[PDB]
From Swiss-Prot, chain B:
Domain of life: Eukaryota
Whole sequence portion shown: 10 to 70 of 2517
Name this protein carries in UniProt: Cullin-9
Disulfide bonds listed in the record: none
Tissue expression pattern: Ubiquitously expressed in all tissues with highest expression in testis brain and kidney.
Assembly mode: Component of the Cul9-RING complex consisting of CUL9 and RBX1; the CUL9-RBX1 complex is a heterododecamer composed of six CUL9 and six RBX1 protomers. Interacts (via C-terminal TRIAD/RBR supradomain) with E2 ubiquitin-conjugating enzyme UBE2L3. Interacts with CUL7; the interaction with the CUL7 component of the 3M complex leads to inhibition of CUL9 activity. The CUL7-CUL9 heterodimer seems to interact specifically with TP53, likely via the CPH domain. Forms a complex with p53/TP53 in the cytoplasm of unstressed cells. Interacts with UBCH7 and UBCH8.
Family: Belongs to the cullin family.
Post-translational modification: Neddylated. Neddylation is mediated by E1 enzyme UBA3-NAE1 complex and E2 enzyme UBE2F. Structural rearrangment of the C-terminal TRIAD/RBR supradomain may play a role in neddylation and deneddylation.
Free-text note regarding domains: The C-terminal TRIAD/RBR supradomain is essential for ubiquitination activity. The IBR domain is required for interaction with UBCH7 and UBCH8.
Signal peptide positions (record): none
Cell compartment(s), UniProt: Cytoplasm
Function of the molecule: Core component of a Cul9-RING ubiquitin-protein ligase complex composed of CUL9 and RBX1. The CUL9-RBX1 complex mediates ubiquitination and subsequent degradation of BIRC5 and is required to maintain microtubule dynamics and genome integrity. Acts downstream of the 3M complex, which inhibits the ubiquitination of BIRC5. The CUL9-RBX1 complex also mediates mono-ubiquitination of p53/TP53. Acts as a cytoplasmic anchor protein in p53/TP53-associated protein complex. Regulates the subcellular localization of p53/TP53 and its subsequent function.
From Swiss-Prot, chain C:
Assembly with partners or alone: Component of multiple Cul1-RING E3 ubiquitin-protein ligase complexes commonly known as SCF (SKP1-CUL1-F-box) complexes, consisting of CUL1, SKP1, RBX1 and a variable F-box domain-containing protein. Part of a SCF(SKP2) complex consisting of CUL1, RBX1, SKP1 and SKP2. Part of a SCF(FBXO3) complex consisting of CUL1, FBXO3, RBX1 and SKP1; this complex interacts with PML via FBXO3. Component of the SCF(Cyclin F) complex consisting of CUL1, RBX1, SKP1 and CCNF. Identified in a SCF E3 ubiquitin ligase complex together with HINT1 and CDC34. (Microbial infection) Interacts with human adenovirus 5 protein E1A; this interaction inhibits RBX1-CUL1-dependent elongation reaction of ubiquitin chains by the SCF(FBW7) complex.
Entire protein: shown range: 21 to 108 of 108
GO molecular function, one term: ubiquitin protein ligase activity
Residues given in the record as Zn(2+) 3 binding sites: C47, H49, C66, D69
Binding residues annotated for Zn(2+) 2, in chain numbering: C29, C32, C40, H54
Annotated phenotype, changing C32A: Strong reduction in ligase activity
Subcellular compartments: Cytoplasm; Nucleus
Annotated protein name in UniProt: E3 ubiquitin-protein ligase RBX1
Keywords carried by this UniProt record: Acetylation, Cytoplasm, DNA damage, DNA repair, Host-virus interaction, Metal-binding, Nucleus, Phosphoprotein, Transferase, Ubl conjugation pathway, Zinc, Zinc-finger
Domain topic, free-text comment: The RING-type zinc finger domain is essential for ubiquitin ligase activity. It coordinates an additional third zinc ion.
Known function: E3 ubiquitin ligase component of multiple cullin-RING-based E3 ubiquitin-protein ligase (CRLs) complexes which mediate the ubiquitination and subsequent proteasomal degradation of target proteins, including proteins involved in cell cycle progression, signal transduction, transcription and transcription-coupled nucleotide excision repair. CRLs complexes and ARIH1 collaborate in tandem to mediate ubiquitination of target proteins, ARIH1 mediating addition of the first ubiquitin on CRLs targets.
Effect of C47A: Strong reduction in ligase activity
Transmembrane domains' residue ranges: none
Length: 137, 44, 80, 72, 73
């Protein structure tokens, strides 16, 4: 669909942006922007959160997506899901990811809203970050 | 016609033809100080 | 029967330290209370407010209205 | 000649009490402003001038109320 | 996140974006003027279009530009 095409465009653009940012390693009170009694009509007064969820979801495996896809099918242009259900699915996936994917899936502001040594390095190469700090030092 | 951006922009060409469902033309615009960039314009 | 052609009604706008620097009315001046060693005498004005000569000197040097009642400040020289 | 003496306060107190009724019986004519532009510096606290200015401030408020109605 | 990081490299991005906004909006303004000159009875409808445009810019500023001075520019 055209909406499905829009979602696909969002998926591609997000993948690209995350890759460029992370790979390249680079990672107020309201007031009228226009000033240098009728009130200012424009001044007076989540989908992005949802899209984030859909995205981190589709980064999981297919048959592992089928349960949440069924749940939604019983619960997709508009998914007015509950905060509890989204938080539950996110917590469940919080164990199913790995490494830098885990960090990123935990590193977003949405999180604020809501062998062995190799495993430690994959979860956190911050030991290598501190090695870099020491080498500079 | 070159609306002041110091700089003023003059059209170059119609380098393609493609929401509302109607003709959308990519038009280049060469800047001149007192590099050309493309914008998607409509027929009117 | 009678009819009203015009009318006029009346009403009052019914609602005390040195408000401008907020120190106690009889106390000293905060500007000079930072620089301890108290030389500001109180000043009175026609509009019947009492403020510190320091406060008022500065404020007036800035602006030329009474900060409390929106009238041109006039240093009270009666009885003097 | 009364200015600067003690009698000023009592004279002003008495003057206020008639200027009140005169202003409520007739709008602030030329007469009251002219008499005041003669003998103003006699009144120590400048109460009568403030009554006169009050009538003008009230006309300004009437203008603003009209505008406010329009905005609503 | 990426838009903010690009906003955190400020001069070139700011300059390019400012030029693009100028061009787009002025083309749109000439279009609206040309439409308005056709019939005098359209300014009454012209007001809400300006309202919506200002709305969109204010939303963009409130969601994607941290610092003030950039927003007022
Ligand atoms: Zn004071
Ligand atoms: Zn003092
Ligand atoms: Zn006062």
């Amino acid at each position: 669909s055209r909406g499905q095409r829009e979602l696909e465009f969002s998926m591609a653009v997000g993948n690209l942006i995350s890759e460029l940012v992370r790979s390249m390693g680079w990672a107020r009170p309201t007031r009228s922007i226009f000033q240098p009694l009728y009130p200012l009509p424009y001044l007076q007064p989540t989908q992005a959160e949802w899209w984030e969820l859909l995205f981190f979801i589709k980064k999981l495996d297919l048959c592992e997506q089928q349960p949440i896809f069924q749940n939604l099918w019983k619960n997709l242009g508009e998914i007015s899901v509950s905060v509890e259900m989204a938080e539950s699915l996110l917590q469940v996936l919080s164990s199913r990811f790995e490494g830098s994917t885990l960090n990123d899936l935990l590193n977003s502001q949405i999180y604020t809203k809501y062998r062995p040594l190799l495993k430690r390095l994959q979860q956190e190469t911050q030991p290598f970050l501190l090695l870099l700090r020491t080498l500079d030092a | 016609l070159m609306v002041p951006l110091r700089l003023q922009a003059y059209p170059e060409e119609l380098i393609r033809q493609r929401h509302d469902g109607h003709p959308e033309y990519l038009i280049r615009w060469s800047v001149l100080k007192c590099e050309h960039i493309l914008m998607w314009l409509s027929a009117p | 029967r009678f009819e009203v052609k015009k009318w006029n009604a009346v009403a009052l706008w019914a609602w005390d330290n040195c408000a401008i620097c907020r120190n106690h009315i009889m106390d000293l001046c905060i500007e000079c209370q930072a620089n301890q060693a108290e030389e500001c005498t109180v000043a009175w004005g026609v509009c019947n407010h009492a403020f510190h000569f320091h406060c008022i000197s500065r404020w007036l040097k800035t602006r030329q209205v009474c900060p409390l009642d929106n009238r041109e400040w006039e240093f009270q020289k009666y009885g003097h | 000649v009364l200015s600067g003496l003690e009698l000023a306060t009592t004279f002003e107190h008495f003057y206020q009490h008639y200027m009140a009724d005169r202003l409520l019986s007739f709008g602030s004519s030329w007469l009251e402003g002219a008499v005041l532009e003669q003998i103003g510096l006699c009144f120590p606290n400048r109460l009568p001038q403030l009554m006169l200015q009050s009538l003008s401030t009230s006309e300004e408020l009437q203008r603003q109320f009209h505008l406010f109605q329009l905005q609503r | 996140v990426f838009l903010r990081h690009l906003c955190q490299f400020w001069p070139l991005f700011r300059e390019q974006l400012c030029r693009r906004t100028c061009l787009f909006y002025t083309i749109r303004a000439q279009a609206w003027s040309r439409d308005i000159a056709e019939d005098h009875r359209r300014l009454l409808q012209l007001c809400p279009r300006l309202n919506r445009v200002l709305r969109h810019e204010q939303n963009f500023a409130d969601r994607f530009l941290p610092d003030d001075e950039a927003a007022q520019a």
